[PDB]
Design a protein around this ligand. Structure first.
Ligand SMILES: [Zn+2]
Ligand SMILES: [Zn+2]
Ligand SMILES: [Zn+2]
Length: 178
């Protein structure tokens, strides 16, 4: 197995996947690494299994159809993995914890949002459809773009949104377009 966490790329107290060489900190993995379970399979392995059990799940889909899916166990897992893929990028640090807004010439967002809040919301089964999760994720970056206006820091929002959207299209097998 790897000797660094797959998500944050640091050593420490790592839990190792039994079916692939990835390792994780307890709370870097999503869901948090399960207490018992020997063997244990990580989220990457669990997603690969879904795909292997239903190869047709990789044919293209319309985003509108994906968004209306109810959060049954497989869609719950897919959203957890997509959230994890965003945390895998180091620039996710800027969006993880609860933000505050005091900048001359800008007003804070009406509905603040951040990664750890989405993480809690998934953990507590607060989303009933994929749309709920995707909306909160997109709102993180939209809030950031609006607040930082012409400051070059706005680019961080664009960058992390691009990681989110690329992973969304991959995980949910959105039909490729120009
Ligand atoms: Zn970690
Ligand atoms: Zn694995
Ligand atoms: Zn099948």
């Amino acid at each position: 197995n790897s000797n660094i966490c797959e998500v944050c790329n640091k050593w420490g107290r790592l839990f190792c996947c039994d079916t692939c060489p990835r390792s994780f900190h307890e709370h870097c993995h999503i869901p948090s690494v399960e207490a018992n379970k020997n063997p244990w399979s990580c989220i990457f392995c669990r997603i690969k299994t879904i795909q292997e059990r239903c190869p047709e799940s990789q044919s293209g889909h319309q985003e509108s159809e994906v968004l209306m899916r109810q959060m049954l166990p497989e869609e719950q897992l897919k959203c957890e993995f997509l959230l994890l893929k965003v945390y895998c990028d180091s620039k996710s640090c800027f969006f993880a914890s609860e933000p505050y807004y005091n900048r001359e010439g800008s007003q804070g967002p009406q509905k603040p949002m951040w990664l750890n809040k989405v993480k809690t919301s998934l953990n507590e089964q607060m989303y009933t459809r994929v749309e709920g999760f995707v909306q909160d994720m997109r709102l993180i970056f939209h809030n950031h773009k609006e607040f930082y206006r012409e400051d070059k820091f706005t680019r961080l929002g664009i960058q992390v949104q691009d990681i989110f959207e690329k992973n969304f299209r991959n995980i949910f097998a959105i039909q490729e377009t120009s």
